[PDB]
Scaffold this active site. Structure first.
Site, PDB file in Angstrom:
ATOM      1  N   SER A   1       1.379   6.894  13.222  1.00 30.78           N
ATOM      2  CA  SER A   1       0.347   6.416  12.300  1.00 30.78           C
ATOM      3  C   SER A   1      -1.032   6.988  12.632  1.00 30.78           C
ATOM      4  CB  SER A   1       0.301   4.890  12.313  1.00 30.78           C
ATOM      5  OG  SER A   1       1.528   4.340  11.840  1.00 30.78           O
TER       6      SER A   1
ATOM      7  N   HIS B   1       7.472   4.060  16.687  1.00 28.33           N
ATOM      8  CA  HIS B   1       7.128   3.221  15.537  1.00 28.33           C
ATOM      9  C   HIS B   1       8.057   2.009  15.403  1.00 28.33           C
ATOM     10  CE1 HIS B   1       6.027   2.523  11.277  1.00 28.33           C
ATOM     11  NE2 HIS B   1       7.324   2.417  11.063  1.00 28.33           N
TER      12      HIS B   1
ATOM     13  N   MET C   1       1.407   5.463   1.074  1.00 27.75           N
ATOM     14  CA  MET C   1       0.965   6.360   2.128  1.00 27.75           C
ATOM     15  C   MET C   1       1.636   7.724   2.010  1.00 27.75           C
ATOM     16  SD  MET C   1       2.889   4.971   5.558  1.00 27.75           S
ATOM     17  CE  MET C   1       2.943   6.588   6.366  1.00 27.75           C
ATOM     18  N   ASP C   2       0.972   8.701   2.629  1.00 24.32           N
ATOM     19  CA  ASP C   2       1.472  10.041   2.870  1.00 24.32           C
ATOM     20  C   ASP C   2       1.554  10.251   4.375  1.00 24.32           C
ATOM     21  OD1 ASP C   2       1.254  10.690   0.078  1.00 24.32           O
ATOM     22  OD2 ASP C   2      -0.824  11.352   0.384  1.00 24.32           O
ATOM     23  N   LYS C   3       2.279  11.286   4.753  1.00 23.94           N
ATOM     24  CA  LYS C   3       2.224  11.799   6.113  1.00 23.94           C
ATOM     25  C   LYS C   3       1.463  13.117   6.124  1.00 23.94           C
ATOM     26  CE  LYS C   3       5.643   9.018   8.314  1.00 23.94           C
ATOM     27  NZ  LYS C   3       6.868   8.928   9.181  1.00 23.94           N
TER      28      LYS C   3
ATOM     29  N   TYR D   1       0.844  -1.187   0.000  1.00 23.24           N
ATOM     30  CA  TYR D   1       0.000   0.000   0.000  1.00 23.24           C
ATOM     31  C   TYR D   1       0.877   1.234   0.000  1.00 23.24           C
ATOM     32  CZ  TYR D   1       0.897  -0.352   5.010  1.00 23.24           C
ATOM     33  OH  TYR D   1       1.448  -0.452   6.241  1.00 23.24           O
TER      34      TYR D   1
END
EC number: 1.3.98.5
Lengths: 238, 243, 241, 238, 241
Positions: free
Chosen positions: C215, C164, C139-141, C137
């Site tokens: 997250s 994390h 993702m962005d932050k 997958y």
């Protein structure tokens, strides 16, 4: 807060299509010629309606891949728009004019700020070199909620907007249509100019007016060049 | 607040296509050869226009499924862009170049006395000859208008301070990446197009990521899709389309 | 705040396809056999590249309708990814492998030169695991007024990432992650690829990590693709009709 | 907070289609005639069901490219909607009625604000010149969360809504259906009027009521013209 | 905050298709009969698996245009779901069952040896009810500013879920829910499947629950699919043209 009130004119259809060039090329030449003749006869009927002051229309080719051609049609009734759309879709040429985008709206003048009014409610579309179309909403988010503002606040915001717009007098003509209850956004914005750069100049400058900065929510933008009927054959020649 | 003012140059079309390989394979060989010849003659016309300093163009193959080929074209008028796309769509090869994405914009310099249109460096940027780098990157962007992060409500001075930090970060990539910024407010779906040219594709990642820590990008950047590609020299076209 | 610095390795293509079964069924048997042999010869070239430590690849079948097959390819240059994609699309089998999704990125890790450190080199230029299952997958932050990752101080980001990593280490020996960076290259900021012999661990890890502050507060996720390994010796059987 | 309570009537299907004109044109004339006769026999069954007060339906042509025709069908069971949908798709004409959009809901009356109640729960759809359809949610975002407001807070907001709506008595008939748990939005809004402009006047004026301004989240808007069954043959003539 | 822990059961596939009626009508009658018989033989294999308590399935026709038919399949491994999907796609009928939507998840029970309790096992490995109607939608829990589910304490989340359960128990005997978890497996965080003999109960329950604080403040919902049961003895009649 107090609802804005409107005067309303002709219904407006923006009909955008993509041209299926690869399929068009396979059609025998005499059938392409007949399709172009059939299309131009249809437009002849539209021109008759316009000369009788019972509607107006404009045809533009669109730059980029979002669309290739735009038919903008103004009529007194929604039924006439349905009938014009249906008649167009039954032409041979329309088999090669694939759906791209459309917009249903009605010419609108508001309460915020005679022959002159009727020229705006029932407009004869300008024969400018270029066109620009986009739809928009006014935001309803947190403190940027246009519809919760007082009438006085909305009037002052629109005054500033109009002052910016007046700087482009003689360079750009706008036709604003209202579409609340009729299509997916709240207004349609159509701009006409002989210099496409003025679309960029005007819209960008207006984005710093507070009404646009805080409340504008924009859809897709379509820019095009006028297609005189005397150029149609040439444009569709393969 | 005070509206930004712009200097505006050539009109720009980014035309992205996907290649219909399965259909192309069914076309007889001599018809494919003719289609490639026809395309190269079209590009020969673009090269003539570029040599006469009346436009510019670039052709890149795009990695991944969002697109397979990019034609980037600069011309002095919008009509010329439309004529070029129509002429392209009437070629045989274009029947196998399926629409993927497109972008319409104008080369733009900001205002963040002498007439800038007469300044040599300004003219070089307003009417640019596109570099022939190994790699290209394209994406569109907006500047945010949300809550207290509203770019268009900031004063001109606030915007100038933020852009000075941006320029400081960009100057670190001098000689590694060249950017061509186009403006598209009123012309397409985002507010700017960003095209980057580099001989090292990693620099695209290095620059954009580092810039994301500048406040103007961190707080106001809204980005579309990113397209990255490798230069397609015309002498390689026949080889690329060989089946 | 101070910009993050990264170590960069091989370029990565995630190429997802849907299988046009109805069209494949109409292709004569001997042409299907030829198409499979042609595809396997291409993969044989990829395996040679991997054995020479100049790239890596993995092939998985994807569950559900978002995609049916995934080719994950690592190479030292972007040009090689373009060439492999072009060569694949010119095969006969590719006429039945319709586009579904794709991702372009670079293997990423966030005085001595780290590029000369053995463990860094093993992660920047990885041989992809041959696990039973894969998960991908992007993702962005998050960049919002309340929570903007890129406006945090370096020390705040480092603290969030230490927590994390503490959560991830609990899954050592259960799940291997390969993080790629895609800022400037594709539509999100990172690609996340997970490899495991137990697909449930994908859920266990990602869900547990969603309660880590990095997250929970900053994660923005794309679509999730889960698949089962396709050994080349099973390709013919998989495509049999 | 206290959940609203509802009385629920007939299930509702909004089935929107696009007409495949280019394919229809290639079908032989007698096969097109047979297709129209088969479709009209199906609608005859719907009319029988309506005359028996066991359902209702309406057929409208839609303006623009989002759809070309709308079948709105009310029935007592979801199974009956499934069966009508399946029977329609098994007609020859449906091969040329391509999917465009659909909505599944149930007629709903709330407890915010007898033969009359049953005339609303099981409505006979009006034969007005025009129809308008759109779905909507009520917002759950930040400080604008409808579902966390108290029952009394929601009642006050709805009182104001009802006051605005009553101004359009005799001009617009609304049929509100609920779709929480049944489709992608929370309500379907269908408006019937002999004057399409009233859709714009009503919806735009209501957007300044606080309930719509602060909590309305809207889907796509579809606006159309009534298709009398005696006009079907003419409409599909090519 | 403390991560939620789960007990996990069978993997779940929701496979939604649209029926290509216009193409199906052109297939010769005897080939349509053969396709229906082949499909029913496949389902017969699924029924065998269910009777042996190694899986479960349900088949429903979906109202509206988002889909026309739903196959919901539970199996002990992801591989088995992939194999059932592939076997279905290789049938003739599947050529007329166009992709519409899909969902991959795993039966999940939360902590808000259990695997040997009979009641826990009936929930982890459920035999799907043969109710008149089905409802499916996916959902996330919100992560936005100070409405962030994953930043709440375990005790806060427990209290919110207690209220949710109070509302749900009012619908005991009318609606059966099967909650699957999909973090790390598909695009949302949970799948929600409801079974009831009264489709209105889907609306009553979901709407009433929307006023519970957990749903009102944190619920984020995908598309909703509602259908009517398709007994296998009705398949031939349903596909008759």
């Amino acid at each position: 807060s107090e609802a804005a009130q409107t005067l309303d004119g002709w219904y407006c259809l923006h009909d955008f299509r993509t041209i299926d060039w690869s399929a068009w090329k396979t059609l025998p030449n005499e059938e392409r010629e007949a399709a172009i003749s059939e299309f131009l006869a249809l437009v002849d009927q539209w021109e008759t309606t316009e000369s009788e002051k019972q509607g107006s229309h404009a045809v533009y080719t669109i730059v980029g891949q979002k669309a290739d051609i735009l038919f903008m049609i103004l009529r007194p009734t929604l039924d006439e728009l349905h009938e014009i759309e249906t008649a167009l879709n039954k032409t041979k040429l329309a088999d090669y004019l694939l759906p791209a985008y459309s917009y249903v709206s009605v010419v609108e003048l508001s309460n915020y700020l005679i022959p002159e009014v009727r020229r705006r409610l029932y407009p004869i579309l300008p024969k400018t070199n270029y066109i620009c179309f986009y739809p928009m909403d006014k935001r309803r988010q947190g403190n940027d909620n246009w519809y919760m503002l007082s009438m006085e606040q909305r009037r002052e915001l629109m005054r500033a907007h109009g002052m910016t717009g007046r700087k482009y007098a003689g360079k750009v003509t706008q036709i604003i249509t209202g579409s609340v209850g009729l299509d997916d956004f709240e207004w349609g914005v159509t701009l006409f100019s002989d210099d496409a750069l003025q679309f960029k100049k005007l819209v960008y400058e207006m984005r710093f007016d507070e009404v646009s900065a805080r409340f504008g929510e924009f859809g897709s933008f379509f820019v095009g060049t006028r297609l005189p009927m005397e150029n149609v054959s040439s444009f569709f020649h393969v």
